[PDB]
Enzyme design. Structure first.
Site, PDB file in Angstrom:
ATOM      1  N   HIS A  13      41.656   3.368  18.155  1.00 40.03           N
ATOM      2  CA  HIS A  13      40.961   3.334  16.877  1.00 40.03           C
ATOM      3  C   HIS A  13      40.824   4.595  16.080  1.00 40.03           C
ATOM      4  CE1 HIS A  13      40.040  -0.705  17.996  1.00 40.03           C
ATOM      5  NE2 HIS A  13      39.530  -0.270  19.134  1.00 40.03           N
ATOM      6  N   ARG A  21      48.805   4.043   4.047  1.00 44.10           N
ATOM      7  CA  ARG A  21      48.208   3.090   4.971  1.00 44.10           C
ATOM      8  C   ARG A  21      48.694   1.741   4.532  1.00 44.10           C
ATOM      9  NH1 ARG A  21      42.707   5.856   3.476  1.00 44.10           N
ATOM     10  NH2 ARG A  21      41.720   3.883   4.081  1.00 44.10           N
ATOM     11  N   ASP A  22      50.014   1.573   4.592  1.00 50.91           N
ATOM     12  CA  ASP A  22      50.676   0.336   4.197  1.00 50.91           C
ATOM     13  C   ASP A  22      51.109  -0.424   5.453  1.00 50.91           C
ATOM     14  OD1 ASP A  22      52.760   2.155   4.988  1.00 50.91           O
ATOM     15  OD2 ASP A  22      54.189   1.333   3.546  1.00 50.91           O
ATOM     16  N   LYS A  40      48.498  -7.070  19.534  1.00 53.53           N
ATOM     17  CA  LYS A  40      47.058  -7.219  19.267  1.00 53.53           C
ATOM     18  C   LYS A  40      46.939  -7.959  17.937  1.00 53.53           C
ATOM     19  CE  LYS A  40      43.180  -4.150  19.670  1.00 53.53           C
ATOM     20  NZ  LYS A  40      42.725  -2.808  20.172  1.00 53.53           N
ATOM     21  N   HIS A 114      33.861   1.695  22.113  1.00 59.34           N
ATOM     22  CA  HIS A 114      34.207   0.351  21.675  1.00 59.34           C
ATOM     23  C   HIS A 114      33.953   0.217  20.176  1.00 59.34           C
ATOM     24  CE1 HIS A 114      34.204  -4.112  21.572  1.00 59.34           C
ATOM     25  NE2 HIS A 114      33.144  -3.967  20.797  1.00 59.34           N
TER      26      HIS A 114
END
Length: 123
Positions: A13, A21-22, A40, A114
């Site tokens: 993450h 950020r395509d 995922k 998390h």
């Protein structure tokens, strides 16, 4: 696995400074991070510095949230990669959604371990 959960958090993450950020960015970083054996279905990366994300664990940048989570007080540049295609097996095709808002994390020993993906499964 002492503090190995925080390392794993960062691996799934965190991305200090992405460029575009395509979709291609998603397919690339998901592959590179190894979130592609079974693909995922959805994954979000947080951008910015680590100090800020870690602070979500203290009152500095966090508030208790739901059962046992923490919600940040500040907003973060974020990118959500949603699997596209309906097949958990590669090639993994992702659609990117760039965003700016606060995030929900679970902390352990003052460290994030998390990310609650539910607030990004923006349906």
């Amino acid at each position: 696995q002492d503090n190995s959960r925080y390392t794993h958090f960062l691996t799934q993450h965190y991305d200090a400074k992405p460029q575009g950020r395509d979709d291609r960015y998603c397919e690339s970083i998901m592959r590179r991070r190894g979130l592609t054996s079974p693909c995922k279905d959805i994954n979000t990366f947080i951008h910015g510095n680590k100090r800020s994300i870690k602070a979500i664990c203290e009152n500095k940048n966090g508030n208790p949230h739901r059962e046992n989570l923490r919600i940040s007080k500040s907003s973060f540049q974020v990118t959500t990669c949603k699997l596209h295609g309906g097949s958990p097996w590669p090639p993994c095709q992702y659609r990117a959604t760039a965003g700016f808002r606060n995030v929900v994390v679970a902390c352990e020993n003052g460290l994030p371990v998390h990310l609650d993906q539910s607030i990004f499964r923006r349906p």
